[PDB]
């Protein structure tokens, strides 16, 4: 009924709210601290911070905090990416107040006790371990660290050698410098904005400029290669995409989809996916491949991902490239761009068809722009992309510094010079 309601304060923190109909409300304070905010000496402290969200803080002991949310059947999720760190908080309409006072403690009153922070430490390994089970995670990670040099090439997961060495002052300093007013965006899905503000005003007023971590962007072509014993091999090939919320970017997104192979059908094969077709024809029976597309504030990464077998690695890899070369040679007919488009549009909508989805989308936008762009407008922007534009962007991959990351038996994985 009532649409969202943004409001930038004097501090510069953003806040939104949507009194929805249904029974479930969810706050989420998104602080601007991603993994790109750590240095050589600070690496792995966001990771630990992410995992220390239930520790004692100034008003609420670790015990109260967890038993408290249990009391009421809430959930407290602490999500992070290379650029941001969403602190989610779900619970029943009637219990938001009990819950909010928890989110506030957790975020503005953390008390990292030597003893408490010390117990955690080992959790990092356990966490890292489970996430590194998906080749995607280590390759994807390795990708970022090869393509960047300084900031976005920092991974999400603590470096093995740092684990036990993440000190209390480190956490306290990261909170202090990054968990600040200018970088924050409140976001409610079932709360009163009037009452939200009040609270935001009372609890979120802290000073801290950007880049006390060492903010800045830079792309650098590089290749990280991980040999294994596994039959299958994964590899990424990516060159500087266009930036976040910019036209070029958007273009990329649309091109992405022309090749992009995320199956829309269970047990179904893509007929739409060029990459898949092309790859497929020159490739063996079992394989899988998809267009990769990343966009961040101050740079992007666009290019594709492959999953071949030991002796097909190259064939696949090249095949994919060649095809994306085709579009950059100009060869791309109108029919396919419009399908792509509609694919993308559909996607975005579904992406925001959920509370959790919406709440992410909103916060996300808060941190980038400073307001909420409605869907419609969104939709218009994507449509504006020119059928040529797409090609043009694609031209850029082929004529853009390469950066690749592979895993598995790498006898048959092309190097930079190979392609």
């Amino acid at each position: 009924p009532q649409d969202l309601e943004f409001t930038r304060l004097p501090n510069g923190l953003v806040i939104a709210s949507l009194e929805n109909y249904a029974p479930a409300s969810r706050i989420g304070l998104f602080i601007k601290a991603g993994s790109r905010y750590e240095n050589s000496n600070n690496l792995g402290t966001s990771h630990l911070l992410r995992l220390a969200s239930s520790l004692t803080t100034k008003g609420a002991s670790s015990f109260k905090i967890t038993r408290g949310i249990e009391a009421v059947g809430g959930k407290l999720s602490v999500t992070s990416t290379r650029e941001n760190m969403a602190y989610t908080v779900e619970c029943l309409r009637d219990d938001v107040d009990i819950l909010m006072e928890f989110l506030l403690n957790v975020t503005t009153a953390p008390e990292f006790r030597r003893w408490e922070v010390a117990a955690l430490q080992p959790q990092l390994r356990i966490d890292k371990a489970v996430a590194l089970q998906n080749p995607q995670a280590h390759v994807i990670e390795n990708l970022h660290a090869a393509a960047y040099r300084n900031a976005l090439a920092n991974s999400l997961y603590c470096p093995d050698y740092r684990i036990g060495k993440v000190t209390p002052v480190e956490l306290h300093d990261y909170v202090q410098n990054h968990f600040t007013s200018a970088r924050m965006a409140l976001i409610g899905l079932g709360v009163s904005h009037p009452v939200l503000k009040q609270v935001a005003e009372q609890f979120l007023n802290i000073r801290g400029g950007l880049g006390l971590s060492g903010a800045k962007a830079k792309y650098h072509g590089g290749e990280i290669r991980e040999q294994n014993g596994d039959s299958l091999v994964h590899a990424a090939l990516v060159a500087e995409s266009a930036a976040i919320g910019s036209a070029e970017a958007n273009a990329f997104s649309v091109l992405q989809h022309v090749l992009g192979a995320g199956p829309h059908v269970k047990r179904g094969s893509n007929a739409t996916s060029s990459l898949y077709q092309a790859v497929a024809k020159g490739v063996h029976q079992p394989f899988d491949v998809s267009a990769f597309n990343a966009s961040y504030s101050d740079s992007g990464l666009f290019g594709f991902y492959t999953i071949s077998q030991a002796a097909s690695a190259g064939d696949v890899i090249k095949a994919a490239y060649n095809q994306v070369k085709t579009i950059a040679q100009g060869n791309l007919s109108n029919p396919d761009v419009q399908a792509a488009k509609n694919k993308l549009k559909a996607g975005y909508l579904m992406s925001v068809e959920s509370s959790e989805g919406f709440l992410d989308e909103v916060g996300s936008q808060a941190l980038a722009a400073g307001s909420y762009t409605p869907p419609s407008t969104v939709l218009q922007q994507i449509d504006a992309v020119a059928d040529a534009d797409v090609i043009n962007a694609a031209k850029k991959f082929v004529s853009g510094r390469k950066s690749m990351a592979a895993s598995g038996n790498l006898g048959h994985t092309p190097f930079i010079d190979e392609l």
Partner: protein, 106 residues
């Protein structure tokens, strides 16, 4: 309304501490504690410095006990220097457990 009493109370305290073997031993009131479950967790929470110190002082202590010799008058623990360094840590531990107990009522 404790003015004379407080001073009087303070006076009584110095004599007990001085009188106690702990002052003579050189181990601060905090090292004399009965090591139980709460004390145990507070202990674990101690800094390397604080913590290693307790280990040496008890080391030196149990060494004297073993030999039945007292430390020199010059080197004793003076009441005015009551490092209640455990207290801080020990408090919370209890604080946290009281809470837990209370949260379990209903």
């Amino acid at each position: 309304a404790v003015s004379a009493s407080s001073r009087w109370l303070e006076g009584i305290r110095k004599w007990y501490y001085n009188a106690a073997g702990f002052n003579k031993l050189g181990l601060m009131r905090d090292d004399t504690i009965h090591e139980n479950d709460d004390v145990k967790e507070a202990i674990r929470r101690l800094p390397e410095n604080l913590y290693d110190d307790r280990v040496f002082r008890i080391k030196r202590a149990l060494d004297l006990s073993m030999r039945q010799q007292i430390l020199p008058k010059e080197q004793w623990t003076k009441y005015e220097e009551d490092k209640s360094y455990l207290e801080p840590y020990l408090k919370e531990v209890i604080r946290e457990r009281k809470e837990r107990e209370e949260w379990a009522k209903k």
